[PDB]
Structure formats: C-alpha cells, structure tokens
C-alpha cells in the first residue's frame, strides 16, 4: 500500500497519459505544484544568505499584505478541503494534499522573503518573486478554465476556492507590477530619510506583523529587564507625532472652519481627527462582528458531532459539497481558531489607534491652551475673574478627560451595535434579554449616586485632611505643651464623620459590582424559565453569548458618564476661549487706559513722554496708577485713546520689569536668578553683592542650587523681592523698570547699598531707567523724576520743576514585591474571621458557577436554584469585600493616628512634613477608597481564571500537559512585563508632573514673561514638556497592548488544545461533549479573563506599594520653686562627634529669674532645646524642685509648665479652645490673661467672646496676640516658670510690650529663664549665663557682671 502520487487504482489507469496530457484532471494539480516549489528551490540559499539602520518601504505595499494574508486564509481552507476529500475515500490518494502544504509553506517563505528584501534595500532582487507570481497566476487560471470546460459550476466547493485564488493571485501580481512601475528598477534607465534619523519608536513605520503583534516591542521589553528604562532610552518621538505638527494641522482646521464656540470646537476636532477616528471605529466594528461570529462555530461543532460520506462524484473525482464543507467539524474548529487569532488582533489595534489619536489631541489642545495663555490679558477683569486654580484644573482635568473621552468614543459606536446583535443572535439561538439590556442603566444610576457620594466624601475628607495638616504643622508646639490628645480627638471625630461617608461610598460601590455580577444570571434564568414554562418549544453557545453581551454594558455606562463630563468640559473651554486678549523712545500722548474693554477708563488724560537716555525716578500718591502706568507703557492696559511712539536705541525691545507682587520660578535659585540667560560670574557676583544675596545664599543650605520658591525652599517676601530685583537686573538690557523695590524691602542699609548699586549699574550701562517708588531720599536729588498725582502726570523734568510745583514739602517730610508586606496587610487588617469568610464565599461562588454550567450542559443534553445561590453569594461577596475594606481602612487609620501621636520631636526635625503628610493622606486615600475594590476584582478575576483552567482540564484531562508550558510561558511573560510596566508607570507619573508645574509657573509670573517678549523659549519648554509626557504615555499604552496580544495568544493556544483534545476524546472515546462544551465556554472567556487578570494585577502591585510606606510609618500642685539644679547634664543627639552642653552644674534660684542668653553659634540653641527634657542629656544629674526629672512621665511634666516661643503660633478653634481646650478652667482667668497680656480690644471686639473661632491662627487678631496666647497659657496652666524666646521680626514697641508683659510675669510669677540672641535688650533680667563654644564660661547672678566684663559688654555693644 505505498505512496501513490495521483492514486493507485484500475491498474495504473490514473497514470494514463492518453486523451491529452492536460485533460487529465489530476495532472493539473501537479502543474500547480511547479511554481511554488520552484520559488522554494531558488530562494532557500538566498534566505540563508539573509540569515548570515536604513529602511525604505516599497511603494504600494499594504495591499500586498492583505492579499498575502487572505490568500493564506483560503489556502489553509484548501488544505482542510484536501484532507477532507482524500480521507473518507477508499484510496489515499495523495494528490489532494501534497500541493497545498508546499503552497502554504511557499506563501510563508515569500512573505519572509519580501520582509528580508524590505529590510535590505536591494530592489533588483524581487524579479524572482514577480516572475513566480505571474507563473502561478497563469497555472491556476489554466486549471480554472478547464474546470469551466468540464462545466462544474459553483455547486462544488473546489471550483469556488480555485476562482478565489485565481483572482487573488492576479490582483496581487498587479500589486507587484504597480511596484515595478513605481520604483522602476528592472527595465528603466534611471525615501524616509527624515523618518530614518531620529526616534526609537518605529511602530508607525514597520511591517504589518510588527504593527499587529508589536514585535519591535520585544527587543525593548527584553532590554528593559536588565537595565532600567531611562528617559534617554525613550524615543525622540518622530515628526508625525510632534505636538507642533498636530497643532499646525489643527490650526489650519480652525482657520478653515472659522472662515466658512462649542460647535466650532466640535467641527474643528472632527475635521482634524475623523479620518483616523473613523478608521478606528471601522476596525472596531469589524472586531465586534468577528467576535460575534464565535458562537456560531461552537454551536455547529456540537450539533454535527451529535449527528454521529459525500454524494458528488464528477469524472471519478469526489468533490465536497459546500454545505458539507461549512457543515464539517474539524474544519469549523480551525476556522474558529483563525477567527479568534484575527479578532483579538483587530481589537487591540482599535484600542491603539484611539490611544494614538488621543495623545495627539492632548498635544495639540494643550499647545493651543498655552498659546492662548500667551495672548491672554492679565487684567483684574481677565485674571481677576478666573484664578490660576481654574486654569490649572482646566488644563489638567479637562484635557486628560477629553482624551479619555476620545478613548471611549468608539465605544459609543459599538456597545449599541453590541446590544443589538446580541439580541438578534440570542433570538436565533433560543427562539423568542431585556434584563441584560437593563444592566448598563443600573450601572449608570449606581455610578451617579456613587459619584455624588464621592464628591461629598472628598470635600468632607478635604476638611479632615486640612485639619490634620493644621494639627501636624504645629507638632513641636503641641508636643511641647503636651497638647496632642485634644487635637487627636478632634481628628478622630472628623475621621468618624468621614467614615460614615466612606461607608455610604462603599455600599454604593458594592452594589455596582453586585449588579454587575448578578444581572446575567437573572437574565439567563428568566430566559430559559420562559423557554420551558412560557415557550415550551425546544445552550452553552447562548451562555458564551451572555458573556459577550455582558462585557460591553458596564463600559457603556462609564462612556455615558464620560460623555457628560466631556460635554461640560468643552463648554468650559469654549466659554474660556473667548475671554479678553492682550493686544495685537517712550511717548504716550492721548491718555485713556482701562481694564474692562469698554466703559470707565481707569487712567485718562495721560500725556507723558520719556525718551531714551534717561533715569526717571517716579513718584505719586498711594496707588495713583504707578503700576498701571508702567504696564500701560508695556502695552498691558487696554489703551482707549492715544498713540505710542516707541523707539529702541516699529517693534518693541526687551524691557526689564518687576511687578509689585514678586514671582520666582520653582527651580534652582541660580536658575531663578539667571532666567534662561548665559552665566558670567562677574555680573552675578555684583548682583549677589548689591542685593545682599551671598548672606541670602548662605542662609539657604544649597544657595544657588536649592529648589527656590513654591514646592521647594520656602523663602521670605523681602527675599523674593530682592531675588526678583536680581533677576531683573542681571538680564543685560537697554532699559530697566523698577516699580518700588525698596517698598517691601524694609532693610534700610540693604536698600541704601542697593540704591547705590542701582545708580552704579544704570550709570555704567547708559540705558534708560524708570523707578517708580516712594523712596524720596534720592528721588528729588539727581533723577529726572515724574509724579503722577490723581492718576495724571504733573511734571517730567528737572528738579527745579519740583521746586516750582509745591512738591519739596514732602521731600522736607531591586524590584522585589508584595507577598510578605501584603500578608502583613491582610493579617493586621482583617482578622481571620472575615478573611476566611471572604475566601470561602469566593471559592464557593465559583464552584457554584462551574456546577450550574455543568447542569446547563446536562439539561441541554436531556432536551435553576444554583443561579439563585449564585446571585446570593455574589451579593454576599460584594458586601463582605466592601465591609472588610471599610474596617481595614478604619483600624489602619486609627493606627496611623496612634503611631503619629507616640513620636519624638526629633523625627519631625529630621523628616519633612511632606513625607508624613504624603504617606499619610494619599496612601490612606488609596487604602481607603481604591484598594478594596481592586482586590475584590482580582480575587474574582483570577479565581474565574483558575476555575476556567480547571474546567478545561476537567473536560480534556489531557489539557494539563499543555497547561504546564502555557503557565510557564505566562509566568515568564508576566515577569518581564511587570518589570517593564512598573518602571514605565513611575516614569509616566514623574513626567506628567512638570507640565502642570510649568502651567503654574507660567500663570503666576505671566506679565513678566510677556514683558520680556521672551515667549519662544517658554514655547519650547512647553513643547518639550508635552513631548516628554506624550512619549511616556504612548509607550505605556503600547506596552499594555503588547501584553494583551502575547497573553491572549497564549490563551488562544489553550483554547485550541483544549478543544482539540476534547473533540479527540469525543469522536472515538465519545466524551459526551457537554462536559467538553462547558469547558469551551470557559476557554473563550479565558481569553479575556487573562486580559483582566494581567492589567488588574499590575494595578494591585502599585497600590500595595504604598502600603509599604504605611509600614515605614508603622516601623517607627504646681511647681513654684523653680529650683531645678542641673548637675553636669551633658547633651548629645547622635553622640557622634560634638556634644554641646558640657558639665553644666547650674541652678536657677527661686526668684532669680535667670535669663541666660549666650553665643548664638555654638552653645545657645542646644541648651534652649534641651531645657524641656526633650533631648538626650547623656550624663550628669538633673533634679527638679528636689524631684527626679529623668524618670517622670513627660506628658505631665510638659503640661503644667508654660513657656514662650520665638516663632509663636495660635491653634485655630474656639477662643476657649485656643486658650485651654483640655482644661477649660474658668472665664475670669481668660479675661485676666487676654486682657492683661494683649488683644483685649480684639477679644472684646471679637464677635463671639470666649467661644469665637480662632480664624486659622488669628488672621486678624494681632501678631502680638500669639504672644498673648502664650501668656494666656502662662497664666492658665499654673505656670510659675515661663521660658521665653525672642521675637524674630517684631516692632520695637512690640518688643517693649513683650518686655512689659515679661515685667508683669516677673511681678506675678517671678520664675523665668530666657535666651535672646538680641543681647542688647536681654539685659533686663536677674541672672544670666553665657555658654560660649560649648562650656560653662560665664555666669552672672547680678546683671552688672555682664556690663562689667569685656566680652559680655562686647556682645552687649
């Protein structure tokens, strides 16, 4: 029984070459063999030469790929047909399936060949492929015309298949010769060079296999596991994705639409992105339809295999009828497999095209927003209407969610089509669905109530977090007076109010999961119960349809919510976009200028001229239009009437300017000094000298490298005014405007040195200046002054004019992860009595869903109360999850508060408040309102997945042999993808932060930037920020889609193997395919349960990482003697190299209020810190009124001994709560204190009295009211001693009032120990001690020994 080529029968009569060679119907297949094996036998060594930087794709090549692939599809179909025809027959006969296998391999090799000839630019070498393609087109055309001569027609299948690849090969031969015409290589006598030089990200210019499967990502992601992904490793982002380019295209769209509001933005967005958005929607519709084809193949397979030879015979050859073709079993399985392997590639492509269009929308619209910042007026009507928070929330939230809307925009095209086709094929499947079509509005109303509760919850917990910030800012002051507990109680009360709100949030979000996971069960139950009781007419395919319908509905509910937010956002930006713009030597003639663009000119009759070569000191009344006139010269006022001659020694030059309000960019201080200018040491040193900035630089621990301004080193107002003057002065300009720099700079000697340096700089540059201020010490002397009285110019001339206008009278006046810490979370959070119930209910629910699936299979074979148990268990699990997360967050919150209470003040000195507040608030929010739902979703998704692989292994008990490599591959793919995705996620966050940082620093100092006309550099910084955000966003997106392709093909192979082994055991061993079919419907859902599994697993990784930060914060009658004799108590902090206090055996006598101030460099502050027993006094002996002060409860010791401070602060609350909240002793003591200290005329003038709100520090009480509250605590806490510190900045009368209050404290308490680096006012005392260079050097029990000795008087001089 050997291998006959055509067939052995009739004594070699099929080998009869008589009656023509071509009229033999088997010999033509042998003719069709020739071109395919010819191309193989001429192109394998070539390919091996191939096997042994610059790319150019050939012209007209997309149709090559689609014709080659669709010919792969029909050639696989002819492989199936050849096997099905040669197998049920008596012979072998081997002429049905020898040509197709080499043809399949030939198509594979000719596309590898076309790829290897596209990689290497050598166009004269595709002559072989084209002469091949023409030869095979001719040969199958001959076969088809002889099939036509035998008059077969379309009834038999092989006629149709042959005609299909005839027109296939003809049309793709025509593609080849169109390329021949274009590139003109063979018979003609006679590129992406821009796309060459650039970026790493070559996904839009790569072959189709890498466009589909993200093959180029592979070498990236495998590179990413060894070394991390720096920003330099990220691409340069090519021209087609440059934000400027999309912005130009969009502005052309704007101009075309606006030549021919909300509809304008709508039309503009549609015109700029519809040809891709529509392409994305088209791919999405095709993916929906090929998803919706699946169940037809499963139903057909099970019906024909339950059906338990072909009729036609033309010329002795058996042709399979087409109904029997599409009625076959194995053929439909292979078709199902190839349909899934193409469906689940178009879905990812649709995702990606929507994402790419979204990133270009974000780019162009952010660029447009910033361009219309660059022309927006900074008025008190323009900026006075809309603050910077409005425009910051606009940019951030609006543009990101408009992007998320154009993410969800094809969904609003498909989920309706999804629902309609679901209803249609559910009627074809089950005969004569409203429940499942009623589960998207359930999600809509539940999400609506959830978002309302979340809004209210967030704006309540915002007040809770603000109170916590106000209770964590004064940590040292409240711990010093032992006043932590009352603020902890007011926090725990606000926390429990927020906890009631969070319980309502969790209820309304448990019900979404419950409705989400119990609507299909009731839908199927009502469906089949109708089918039996109400219908009585006649399954697993229907269940799979139930899955395919269930998935879009909740997404569509979110789409509708996003649509509403998008419409509101476009309304917001349209009402924003039509606000007032700005506009289109010195001389101003007509004089009318206002802010509102009509009516009430705010500055009129202005006829003032200031030509070049000048130094104008200006003067005027208080707010008489000085900054208004300066900005009006700058062209920043709506000038109604007048003209502006303008000539720099008609275009404007770089006028330096400095507004009344200072401004500093959140950058380095030298970067905030140089301001995008080259750096020379001389002028920089001169400006640091003139503005006295070298002591200011030394006042900072980095100086010219510290992150100045907001989000960094907190500066002072005089420092910021001086920094602004330095940045204004350095920029090397032909004019200089100084609008009162020494107004806020109250340092007179600094101001005088600055005035002299200003004269020197403006005198040594020979450039015009204009200084508008009230410093009249020099302004009427040697300036060309100009005075604006009542908003008008009086005289711009010499000093004799001010001696002629009654103005001198005023001048005469790695990568480790969760499970240890995650185990600690679940253990310390839950308690096993609810964790066990949660895991048991989840496992039981999934066992019930498996069981009801098997019961559905058996009843369908033979042609309820488990779906009810399922719904109840789903409700139970959703309740248990939300309840467990709520209790978890509650007890963790109280734990965080308790560990923050039991802390030393040295940690607050060490660690910033930002770390404690950040890992408090953001991680508490994450482990309170975001982590439990994701945990529940993971615990439902991976358990559905483990269930599904259990079902596949149960149906086909041979599957597990193929499970082990699939799980190994999934484990390795999970590992390498996790390694890339975590780092890329952090790179996304740390790149999306500086763009909105730029929008803050732009919106703050806008008029200075628009004053310099130095917009293009910030334009480049904006475009750089937008590019650095977009490249990370596109790589994160494309990594997600590549993940989904790789894991989803792993799942597809699982489906194929499971179905194959189940069908193999059901053809012969008769597996009773219901157990097999129920396996298959989990095999289809595996394909996306893995999807949900992988994406949610990454999210579970990142959020449990901030629990790590949580673990890090979990890791760490009245004494009236005053006779505490310290006996040699030596102090240390790290006990490393330098103790400060040494051997100080010093006593404060009763009455002898020893105010002991010393040397401020070495021994002043350390003793002042160590005075409250709040530091490590490493030796000696410290008695306190004869008691042991080294082993006492420090809460009781620090409660009843008041002090004063250097930088005092008032805790906000009731006035009795601001005085003594824990005590609340008596009203008359508070009247005596708050009368006799200070602020009696504010307390009695307060609206409430002792029960009035301390308005966040006493915002309009006094500044001496802080010291008054200190004295209140001194009079209230039975405090004989009162340790006082000096005022940092105060008035001399304020220091005298503090001294008078200290005199009253001496008259009433008489115990005090004060240190003051202001030694010349610290002389009113009783005893003193000077402890210089860390010793007991001087002690003066009379006050005259300080004034008697040399050095103490030298410190007193």
Numbering used by the authors: 1 to 52, 63 to 200, 207 to 276, 283 to 330, 335 to 458, 464 to 569, 576 to 621, 678 to 742, ...
What does the paper say about this structure?
Uniquely, the sulfonylurea receptors SUR1 and SUR2 lack transport activity per se but instead are devoted to forming the ATP-sensitive potassium (KATP) channels, wherein four SUR.x subunits form a complex with four subunits of an inwardly rectifying potassium channel, Kir6.1 or Kir6.2. KATP channels are gated by intracellular ATP and ADP, key features which enable them to regulate membrane excitability according to the energetic state of the cell. In pancreatic β-cells, KATP channels composed of SUR1 and Kir6.2 couple glucose metabolism to insulin secretion. The SUR1 protein has an N-terminal transmembrane domain referred to as TMD0 that interacts directly with the Kir6.2 subunit, followed by a cytoplasmic loop termed L0, and then the ABC core structure comprising two transmembrane domains TMD1 and TMD2 and two nucleotide binding domains NBD1 and NBD2.
Further, as an additional control we determined the structure of channels without any pharmacochaperone or ATP (referred to as the apo state). Interestingly, the dominant class emerging from 3D classification for the ATP-only state as well as the apo state presented a similar conformation, with Kir6.2 tetramer closed and SUR1 inward-facing. Of note, a dominant inward-facing conformation in the absence of ligand was also observed in another ABC transporter, the multidrug resistance protein MRP1. These observations suggest the closed channel conformation is the most stable for the apo state under our experimental conditions (i.e. no ATP and no exogenous PIP2, a lipid required for KATP channel opening [Nichols, 2006]). Here, in both the RPG/ATP and CBZ/ATP structures, we observe strong and distinctly shaped cryo-EM densities within the same GBC binding pocket. Such density is absent in the ATP-only and the apo structures, supporting assignment as the pharmacochaperone ligand. By contrast, the KNt cryoEM density is absent in the apo structure, suggesting that when no ATP is bound to Kir6.2, KNt has little residence time in the ABC core central cavity. The fact that despite not seeing KNt, the Kir6.2 channel is still closed in the dominant class structure is likely due to loss of endogenous PIP2 during purification.
